[PDB]
Every structure is written in C-alpha cells, then in structure tokens.
Curated annotation (Swiss-Prot), chain A:
Residues 2-82 form the GST N-terminal domain. Changing I70 to A/V: No significant effect on enzyme activity. Reduces protein stability. This is Glutathione S-transferase A1. It comes from Homo sapiens (Human). Its main location: cytoplasm. Belongs to the GST superfamily. Alpha family. GO terms for cellular component: cytosol; extracellular exosome. The lineage of its organism: Eukaryota, Metazoa, Chordata, Craniata, Vertebrata.
C-alpha cells in the first residue's frame, strides 16, 4: 500500500500523538499540511472528513478521522495495544487519563490571555496531585520498565510524549517522580523514538504566536 | 463471577452509555449510587478510582475507570466491537463523533444560564448539520440494517441512544433522516434493547435539578 498520509495544521495539537506513535512504531509517513481555511474546506467539500474536522489520516485505503480511532487502529496494527482484553483495559484506562491531561495542554493556547495562568496552575496542580502520582503508583507497584504487560505499549509512548510537554511547561514537576524520569530516559533511548527526537524529524514544536492565529484564521 | 457493578450518580451522565451497552449485551448489573461527598471519598480512599473520578465499573475482578476504557472492555467482551481491525476503525470513528456530541449533552446541565442558550443552539445545529447527515450518509452508503459490518455493533446502540436523546430534545430533528428513524425502530425492537427501553428498567431519566444539585453538592459541598 501507500505511506500513511496525515492531514493537519503544521503543528502539534491533535495530530501530534499520532506522529509519535507512528514514529515510535518505525513507520514512515507523509504529511499534507492544512495551511488555510481553503485547504480545510476543500477536504470538507471533497468528502474526506466524516464530521468536517481534522485530524484525518489516509491509511490502508481508509480516510480515518477522530484521534482515538486513528490511534486505536495504529496501536492495534503495530501491536502496541497489548496482547489481551485485560491489557487493553489497563491501557485504555491509562491513556484516557493521559488524554484528559493532554487535552488541557492542547486547549491552553486558545483560552483568553487573562485566564491562561489560572489554567496553567490548575494543570500543574493536576499533574502533581493526580496524574503523576497515579502513573508513578503504577510503575512503583509492579517495578517493571513498561506500564503494562512488561513490554512496550502505546501507553508508554503516550505517557512520555506528555512528560516532554510537561518538561516544557515546568521542569520541576517530574522531580519527585523517579520512575517517571526513568521511563522517559529508557523510552527516549529506543532507536525509533531516539530518531524521532532528533532535529529534522516530523515532530512539532510547542504552539507559538504564528501557529495560534493560523489556527484561528480558520475558525 | 458476579454482576458488573456501576458506581455513579443516580442519573445518566457518563454512565448512561454503559447502561445501554450492557443492557444491549443482555448483561444484568447492579448499581451502587453515590449520594454524597462521603460516598465519593470512600471510593477514593479505598484506592478504587485511579484518577479520583467516576464512572467506575467493577467487572471481572477489575475496577475500570474512564468511560471509554469501560465501554471498550464491555464492547470487546460481548462481541459488540466488530470482527476485525478495519471494522473497529469505522466503529471508533463513528462512536467518537457520537462521543463529541454526547460530551456537550453531558455538560449542558452544569452551564451557567447565560451560556445555556448558545450551548443548546450549538447542539441542535450540529445534530442537524454535522452528525445526523454523517450517519444518514453511512446508512445510505450500504443500505444495511447496521452501521458496520452488517451485524449489531456498539455503534448502533450508542447512535440509537443518541437518537432517543435528540427526540427528547426536539422531535423534529430526526424528521428529515428516514434511515436514522428506521434504525432507531429496528434496534429498539431487538430483545435486549426492547427490554431496557421498557418502563422500570435501569435506563435513567433526563437530568433534572435534583440531579444537578446532587452533583454540585458531592463535588462542592
Ligand atoms: C478553540 C479554537 C479552535 C480549536 C480547534 C481544536 O479542536 C484543534 C486545534 C488545535 O490543533 S483541532 C481542529 C478541530 N478538530 C477537532 O476538534 C477534532 C476533535 C475530535 N474528537 C478528535 O479528537 O478527532 C476541527 O477540525 N474543527 C472544525 C470544526 O469543529 O468544525
Ligand atoms: C462540579 C460539576 C461536576 C461536573 C462533573 C462532570 O464531569 C460529570 C457530571 C455528569 O454527570 S462526571 C464526574 C467527573 N468524572 C469525570 O469527569 C470523568 C471524565 C473521564 N474522562 C471519563 O470519561 O470517565 C468527576 O469524577 N469529577 C471529579 C474530578 O475530576 O475531580
């Protein structure tokens, strides 16, 4: 077949987790960047977008929208979705906690300027008091190098992706969390991810002033 | 061994689609309702809520939190998740569209009133202009009884659950969507679903104000 093709803005938002997972699985993909309202509306009007939204990924002859469906397909295709129904329960429960947190980080650059610090202090507090404790607790309990099933899954992938973003927000958050740190290093050391973490990869930077109003100059 | 046990408020919210899906799967379940902040703190303190949130469903020895984790497990356990990876992808695409709308419906009672008008307009707009046309098209695309793979999946149950909510909201929205009506009727007349739709089932009423103040009082005493 073809390379998976990613339709999105040139930036992180809702496509980034997929860029990570495909690169983490060692899958070359191509990107067709949505640069204007007109790129979006051509996709909408050509019938590529079931709910009129992106992300969309053309992969194995399907036009897949919705981040979770995109990810679930990719996870399952490349065996990063565990080996049984109980591992997937654990994995889903984990990655849904991550996606809740991660959702707040995606929306942060869109709330009104005057609300930004409030939300950031809220996020930070949720990191320190809810999400990091929960994930440390998981690694602490079983002692293993991976979150689930003692081998690599999408949950380690999505978790570390998020540890990077949290490092960007404030780097003292992971400090009381030894095992989160350790996980970040080990997974960052995997050939596929190491590669994706180097300069020139399809990995995207934080949202900046350009990307933010670009995104508005559509909605 | 035992029946699944649902730990939620006494009402729809984030637990309702699990009630439909287990019902649709023909699975009897018990419900333990959270009435007070104390009930919530007992669950948290027992270490039973991984993110300190509910829904929580005790099922097959596990304590599952996160709606989608719960639903995927049930879905997969009772063969309501399609037969292969590509079917799963259509099911997920379809139900995440439903989830997006459902999220707006779930939050709508905890708006300030100044926001409630617009929010309610937005919900109708999207039902009319995005979601119903999207699923109608799918049904037209293949002419079959079911959304995916021509057998009952979780996608028909979540979508029909939605059609019941849109009817309560405004019964004229579905009028221009004959294929959506047809599905609603056929799914409602499957034994497990028929049973759940009858009066006196665990199916829950629309949120009212006793529900809204119950939830406020539990999280903000
Ligand atoms: C608040 C200002 C704009 C914010 C837009 C953000 O949602 C994101 C921008 C950052 O990348 S992404 C663009 C959006 N997509 C979705 O919301 C998909 C959600 C689905 N649940 C998913 O996970 O796939 C979009 O295409 N919107 C057209 C529209 O709604 O008509
Ligand atoms: C003050 C107003 C409260 C509104 C709460 C609403 O979100 C919902 C009400 C619908 O009945 S439900 C209670 C909420 N649960 C989740 O948000 C789970 C989300 C997860 N992504 C899921 O899908 O499972 C909750 O437990 N909140 C405590 C907290 O997070 O600390």
């Amino acid at each position: 077949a073809e390379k998976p093709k990613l339709h999105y803005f040139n930036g992180r938002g809702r496509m980034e987790s997929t860029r990570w997972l495909l690169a983490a699985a060692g899958v070359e993909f191509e990107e067709k960047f949505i640069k204007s309202a007109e790129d979006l509306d051509k996709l909408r009007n050509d019938g590529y977008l079931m709910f009129q939204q992106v992300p969309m990924v053309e992969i194995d002859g399907m036009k897949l929208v919705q981040t979770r469906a995109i990810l679930n397909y990719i996870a399952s295709k490349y065996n990063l979705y565990g080996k049984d129904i109980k591992e997937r329960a654990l994995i889903d429960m984990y990655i849904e906690g991550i996606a809740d947190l991660g959702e707040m980080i995606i929306m942060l650059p869109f709330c009104p300027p005057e609300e930004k610090d409030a939300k950031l202090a809220l996020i930070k507090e949720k990191i320190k008091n809810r999400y990091f404790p929960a994930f440390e607790k998981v690694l602490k309990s079983h002692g293993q190098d991976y979150l689930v099933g003692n081998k690599l899954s999408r949950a380690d992938i999505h978790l570390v992706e998020l540890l990077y973003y949290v490092e960007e927000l404030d780097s003292s958050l992971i400090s009381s969390f030894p095992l989160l740190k350790a996980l970040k290093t080990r997974i960052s050391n995997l050939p596929t991810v190491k590669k994706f973490l180097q300069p020139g990869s399809p990995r995207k930077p934080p949202p900046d002033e350009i990307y933010v109003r670009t995104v508005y100059n559509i909605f």
